[PDB]
Amino acid sequence: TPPNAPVVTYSDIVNDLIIMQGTAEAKSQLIITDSEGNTYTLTVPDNGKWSMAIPYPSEGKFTITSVDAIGNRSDDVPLDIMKEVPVISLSPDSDSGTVGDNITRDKQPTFIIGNLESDVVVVQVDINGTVYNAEKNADGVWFFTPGTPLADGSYTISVIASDAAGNQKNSLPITVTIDSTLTVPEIALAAGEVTNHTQPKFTLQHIDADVTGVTVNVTHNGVTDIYQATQGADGWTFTPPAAWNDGNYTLSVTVVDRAGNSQQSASLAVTVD
């Protein structure tokens, strides 16, 4: 009779080593051969218990076999595990305004998928609870691009990958905000002011809460000067940093939100007396 098939009682992956304990016929050879054709061989101790660590091999694939002292071999115990949790992120090419903040005005952004083992056969994306096939590009790299443009709002995204043996892992969620929406702003003189001040105050209204850039365009006698607004508790504000010539001044405000939407207010043609 051949040795009985060797047994794994415990397995774990730490770093890039597979660690196992198990049992097998005492004093037999335990032969572990992996997908890359490495062989790792040990003599099973006298108690019939063994332990081993091997470098995690390509695709997590390997076989365990026992051979006794007279050359009889057990059944092969072929295993196929998986190690890598897939990763997904917003493509920097679909990421408007600041890059890396997961906010974009792009309504069909691409997501880039990484950290897949070469035996992965199913790759999918969960977007707000609905699961879709990911797609494989020319270079064998996976991605996902929505088929139709997404409405504005928040999308929780997780990537799911599984190999032929049914090992499946999904990423811890990230989210993305699609924002292509911004209110047209407004420049008006402040409440208590044609004006007598050479540094008149301006109230800036209809400035959306997600707005991070605010400038005032002051246009007079063929030259345009661009001013940084002041954000305060009450909102955004502007008074010219220095005294202003007598005459007529044309004004507008331009807002840019964190997504990189931009709006310009209507023209305001005024008079410093």
Tokens standing for residue 41: 């061989």
Tokens standing for residue 263: 């709006």
97 binds, among a second copy, Ca ion, none (CB under 5 to 8 A by kind): Ca ion
Window 122-161: contact mask with a second copy (x via CB under 8 A): ----x--x-x---------------------xx-x-x-x-
Supply the minimum distance, in Å, between the C-beta of residue 216 and a second copy.
Answer: 20
Nearest to 70 by CA among 24, 1, 5: 1
Residue 258 near a second copy by CB under 8 A: yes
Nearest to 101 by CA among 177, 35, 158: 177
Tokens standing for residue 243: 């005294």
Query: Using CB under 5 A, which of 179, 207, 238, 272 touches Ca ion?
Result: 179
> What DSSP state is assigned to residue 83?
-
Query: Nearest-5° angle of CA 233, CA 95, CA 184?
Result: 45
Strand partners, 160: 124, 170
Residue 210 near Ca ion by CB under 5 A: yes
Residue 77 near a second copy by CB under 8 A: yes
Q: What is the Cβ-side half-sphere exposure of residue 159, based on CA atoms within 13 angstroms?
A: 23
> What DSSP state is assigned to residue 147?
S
| Binding site residues, Ca ion, CB under 5 A | 59-60, 80, 82, 95, 97-98, 101, 103-104, 119, 163, 179, 181-182, 194, 210, 257
| Binding site residues, a second copy, CB under 8 A | 1-13, 22-23, 25-26, 48-49, 68-69, 72, 75, 77, 79, 81, 100-103, 126, 129, 131, 153-154, 156, 158, 160, 165-170, 172-177, 179, 181, 183, 208-210, 212, 233, 258
